[model samples]
Target: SHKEFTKFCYEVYNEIKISDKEFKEKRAALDTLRLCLKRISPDAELVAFGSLESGLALKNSDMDLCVLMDSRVQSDTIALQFYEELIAEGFEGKFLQRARIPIIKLTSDTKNGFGASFQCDIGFNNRLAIHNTLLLSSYTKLDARLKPMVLLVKHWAKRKQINSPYFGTLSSYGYVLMVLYYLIHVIKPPVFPNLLLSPLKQEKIVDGFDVGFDDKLEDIPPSQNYSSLGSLLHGFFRFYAYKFEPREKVVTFRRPDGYLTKQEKGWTRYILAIEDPFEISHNVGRTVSSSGLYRIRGEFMAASRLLNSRSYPIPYDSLFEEA
Candidate 1:
């Protein structure tokens, strides 16, 4: 345990270090961009997002910005006017979008690559919940519920030390958000209706053990539980899994396999239970340093007759001969 803890300390510390040169350069570029915004419109706000806000800088991360403009000025026309001004001032850009809610994509080369390592997304904000009226720019809000969950997940992930990086560069907060997306959208939850098809009829997978998918949701089935709510959720998922299968679909991020069961026809209910926390350690001791511990379990699934070659594709049909 001591040796494992020591290894984590070194790895986290090694990864958390941000370069002073890059920090100063990014701040200066932001300042220059801010000046440009005020000169064009006296009442404009330029807000930052992504890596810079999180204090996690990687070699290839973009600087995200939302240029919020005053409502009095036509939102569409003003965004373009600012877009033209930036181009004239020496920013390289293209018609990122040429219609309603137009956007101009800018690169560092646009202004001579003067003081930064990445491009910033210059966007126009229409309305946001924070301010009653319009604001020049606003920061993206993190989901309140999922925020803490991320911290716990990251802490566990750090402990387990999952080496594979997620989202190009993952903050504990990012990993939490990813898990939510995976569970709800990518891995759609199954149906746990009031009734079921079978209770405990099972065929043996091997010489000894036989498992069944039937169970009462009320009972405490074995699974991971972070807190009371998590325990309940784990139970729900276990029940949901017993009754369904996911279908083929694509979102902005993940791609799902196509094979939706009738029970999972409409799985939008899962989205209702999701939220975002800006940083996993916002209130807690979530430091900008090392990513927290992560826990993972391993298991092997055997190919079954239902998943044979004639019924499914290669990997899923690995157990059966090619049809």
Candidate 2:
């Protein structure tokens, strides 16, 4: 059954594609947001990031972008005003500050269909900047190999239809990161088993934070084996490397078991230490943290509570969720 599901994920991955028109519509939404940014702060730094910026976007991927301003700009008020303007215009959307970050989720009717939602995340430009001029901005993002790796993991979950729970929503992007880790580290298949930690570098080497599993998984090359379910799903947690991630690259091992363990205690008591770039962990008190997989689970439950709300008629259920 796992093998069958894996194959299905691969098949779905091959079937999905973004049309030119859909791409144009998404770009137009970004342009509209850009105009909104101009009205809010002309000097504001507005740029696309996440899957779109990384060239790892899926057909149903949300547009992730941010607007960076001075740290003292009081993010909430700015986000509120921007949210009002965007909704006032033609966009059907929801706006909220989750994880203390300002995000605007807008949807537009596209030729593909009606009521298609594209996500746009607005934050400070400096938030992406890591060290010195080596900024973590969109321009410096990864492409191709890393991008496809993400798609592999994402499609696998789609096959299982299991909610990732880390991303809150079972997003295509969330699965993509899961796969990237597998291909790079865990059981580097055909050639080396978990080449990410292997001492070899030329044929396969682990960089400071990045382990180049650039080698073909043993006997299976990229074009042929990527479609197989075993290599991708089985290697998720083992491929996930979570050590020194905030300040370094995360080379994780994929989870041998495909399913992520649900969080036992509430968010207040959960402590995560996985060093993935796409995770958030607070270093206060007992140092609560989570892996990428667990993070997605939390998000899935959180999303469900908002959706099946007991009080549905008053305000948009999407916008009003008690933290």
State which candidate has the highest lDDT: 2
Please list the residue runs of candidate 1 whose C-alpha ends up more than 4 Å from where it truly belongs after superposition.
2-6, 9-13, 110-117, 126-176, 179-323
Provide backbone clash counts, one per model: 17, 41
- What lDDT tens digits, residue by residue, belong to model 1 across residues 1-323? 12332243334434443467766777777788788788888788987655455443443446667777655677667677788777777877654565666676776454456633357777676222112111101111222223233333344344434323441223443343334443333333321111112344233221122222223334423222223323322332342233222222111111133223222323221211112221111211122123321111210012122222253233421211221
Candidate 2 per-residue C-alpha lDDT over 184-235 given as tens digits, one digit per residue, 9 for 90 to 100: 3344342113333334523212122332322333443333234344334334
Alpha-carbon TM-score of each model against the true structure = 0.44, 0.52
Give the candidate number with the greatest TM-score.
Answer: 2
Give candidate 1's error at residue 134 in angstroms: 18
Model 2 clashes, total count: 41
What's model 2's overall lDDT? 0.44
* lDDT agreement with native, every candidate: 0.39, 0.44
Q: Give model 2's TM-score versus the native structure.
A: 0.52
Error of 1 at 40 (Å): 1.1
RMSD, every candidate, angstroms: 17.5, 12.5
